[PDB]
Amino acid sequence: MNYKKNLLLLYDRPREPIFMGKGKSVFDVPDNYLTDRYRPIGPEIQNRFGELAEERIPVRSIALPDLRIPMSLGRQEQFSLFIPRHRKIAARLIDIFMGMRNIEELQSCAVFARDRINPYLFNYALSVALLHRRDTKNLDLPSVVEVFPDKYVDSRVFEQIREEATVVPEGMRMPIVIPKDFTASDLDEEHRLWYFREDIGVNLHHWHWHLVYPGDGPDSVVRKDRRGELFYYMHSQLIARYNFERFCNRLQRVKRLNNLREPIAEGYFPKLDSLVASRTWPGRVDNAVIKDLNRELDQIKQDVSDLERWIDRIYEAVHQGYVVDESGNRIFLDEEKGID
Amino acid sequence: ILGNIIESSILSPNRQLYGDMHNVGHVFLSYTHDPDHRHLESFGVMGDVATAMRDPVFYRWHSFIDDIFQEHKIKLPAYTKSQLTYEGISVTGIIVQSEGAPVNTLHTYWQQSDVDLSRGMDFVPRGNVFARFTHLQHAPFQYVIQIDNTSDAQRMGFVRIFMAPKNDERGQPMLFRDQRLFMVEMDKFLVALRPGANRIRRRSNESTVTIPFERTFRGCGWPAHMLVPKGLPEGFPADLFVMVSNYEDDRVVQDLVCNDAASYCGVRDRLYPDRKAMGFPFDRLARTGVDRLSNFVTPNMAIQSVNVIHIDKTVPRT
Ligand SMILES: [Cu+2]
Ligand SMILES: [Cu+2]
């Protein structure tokens, strides 16, 4: 009953229902644990999936926390921790996996949750939980690349893989070469930094940072010592490291955005497609304008001048040498704690 | 309003609130050596109108200020294609001609000029005392502009000439988001345009931007010998721009002491003779889909490559 090892299976093939069996194992899930769609074909499922496996994993039925908030984001929708609504949803699902009394009940709770939740969100929240619970330390989480390649690779290679896997028997299959320097041509000097910007290691680093220092969740997960300063310092070392690369590609140091009104010159077309959402990360044209936001579904109604305002407030607070509490009390930006 | 707030003239609507930012910064920058007057020292050169432009930090301070004005400027709607075209008016060409030089070429060099410092040498024996000053100078030139009218009727137009570098620091063609701030005003004057083709000649020493050379070296204006940038000995590339705007919209209601008299003196004239914003048409962000001066231009505008040449040699003034 190595729950720990069995939890790792929940990362295998995130869009495949859990009853299809991961690695060499299958879960034996209660009938009320199946979704409404697949409950009717329960018998057939057992037949193929259930029988072909070496290890069958019994899941004990339990009473389940309220999963509405985490289910409220759609299975074919996109997931961003930058959008407040999604942060709030993730925070809650994290609390739920943190709060299970038992590593066995975590297994049972996750098995239930998995095919009812957005896979990206499931990966995030489950990961943050496994990294923080006492009973799930020392656990070798799969790289996000390994389980969601769609966020890391030219969308063109998926059919190249689909074909190779389908036509060629495995022992004979050729590795697929991942394109590099593929997002832009020589006419865009910015393409020179492909090896920094589009390197799975640095993007994983950015992702890992939001796994260890999430912005909303249980106190235990959020409140790390000096996390406000690490935020500053990490983003600051990235720019230092990014400028080092620029100097090595005959470019200038990177220039801040002048303001939030003038166009952004450098466009970008990522060439990524999401197999979860079956929708792209739309590129941004050259010379695009920042526009007032009214995203009803995302729950974002915010003008550019609302952003201008926060920045102004923040600059006033930096110049004053203190921030003002929600009550009106002064907290000094001293030498020890000001940066945090 | 913003300029009166920032300078802090008397006309500022609330000097208590917005303070006296520009003047006091000057004073701050001029007092770093003795801010509490314990060393009984006066202000550096930045503390004096007479002398402030000498110090490199003048441009740094004023650039900081400009960013504030720019922050207002980018809030205004881009000028529309409607707002820029002068319907019926179309500028086909502008060239610059100098004496003894190829078309589309400006020329700069050094010059020596004498000035009598005798009226200023207190307690020195009377008589002429000549100081010889060395300073930039350009060779005289004329714009030639071709405008096609197309109305059956006479049309009045403001001719607005600017000039900018072609390329950024790195020798790359500049883009409008940057170029517009690098446009130097060279002349503004009114013309009458007969129906059909018009050929306008305009000499350099007519520029409304400048004042005679006689008034510097023996009615506010830039000194004539600094009209043209230094340029380079191998040749420095610039973009010359001209726009012919519709004077019937640019016209100012006031009528005071031939409309073509464009010499403006702030004391003399009660009102500024052009309703457009100073710096028009470059003072705002480009309308959607304009990235460079090539795409900005309406028919009543025109662009020309110009080569600015510097010769490192000294002439006695002719
Ligand atoms: Cu980050
Ligand atoms: Cu000043």
Whether B308 contacts B228, CB under 8 Å: yes
B97: left (phi over 0), alpha (psi -120 to 50) or beta: beta
Closest partner residue to B75 (CB to CB) among A252, A261, A263 is: A261
**CB neighbourhood size of B172 (10 A):** 10
Give dist(CA A287, CA A264) in Å, integer.
5
- From the CA of B74, how many Å to the nearest CA of chain A? 6
Give dist(CA A62, CA A79) in Å, integer.
28
What's the gap in Å between B26 CA and the centre of ligand 2?
A: 6
H or E element in which residue A104 lies: helix A103-114
- Helices in chain B by DSSP H: which ranges? 2-7, 15-18, 21-29, 57-73, 81-84, 176-179, 247-250, 293-296
Nearest to A161, CA basis, from A174, A171, A152 = A174
Closest partner residue to B285 (CB to CB) among A262, A265, A286 is: A262
Which ligand is in closest contact with the Cα of B29?
2
Nearest to B260, CA basis, from B203, B189, B310, B188 = B189
Give dist(CA A84, CA A299) in Å, integer.
8
Give dist(CA B244, CA B88) in Å, integer.
11
* Burial (CB count within 10 angstroms: exposed 0-12, middle 13-18, buried 19+), residue A26: buried
Give the number of C-alpha atoms closer than 13 A to the C-alpha of residue A1, restricted to the C-beta side: 9
- Helices in B143-252 by DSSP H: which ranges? 176-179, 247-250
Q: Which residues in chain A touch residue B291, judged by CB atoms under 8 angstroms apart?
A: 286-287
> To what resolution in angstroms was this structure determined?
2.7
Elucidation technique: X-ray
Q: Which two tokens stand for residue B309?
A: 């040449």
What's the gap in Å between B13 CA and the centre of ligand 2?
A: 20
Which ligand is in closest contact with the Cα of B30?
2
Rounded to the nearest 10°, the torsion over CA A316, A320, A321, A325 is -70
Residue B45 DSSP code: G
Q: Which residues in chain A touch residue B175, judged by CB atoms under 8 angstroms apart?
A: 265
Give dist(CA B273, CA B150) in Å, integer.
26
Q: Which residues in chain A touch residue B170, judged by CB atoms under 8 angstroms apart?
A: 252
Q: What does DSSP say about strands A273-274 and A55-58: parallel, antiparallel, or unpaired?
A: unpaired
Indicate yes or no: CB of B74 within 8 angstroms of CB of A287.
Answer: no
Give dist(CA B300, CA B155) in Å, integer.
12
Contacts of residue A1, defined as CB under 8 A and 6 or more positions apart, other chains included, come to A104
Whether B317 contacts B112, CB under 8 Å: yes
What is the SS3 assignment for B306? strand
Active-site amino acid positions of B: 7
Q: Which two tokens stand for residue B165?
A: 């570098």
Contacts of residue A331, defined as CB under 8 A and 6 or more positions apart, other chains included, come to A322, A323, A324, A325
DSSP secondary structure letters along B115-151: EE-GGG-TTSPSS--EEEEEEEEE--EEEEEEEE--S
Say how many Å lie between the first and final Cα of chain B, rounded: 46
Whether B227 contacts B208, CB under 8 Å: no
Whether B167 contacts B117, CB under 8 Å: no
Give dist(CA A101, CA A135) in Å, integer.
10
H or E element in which residue B302 lies: strand B301-316
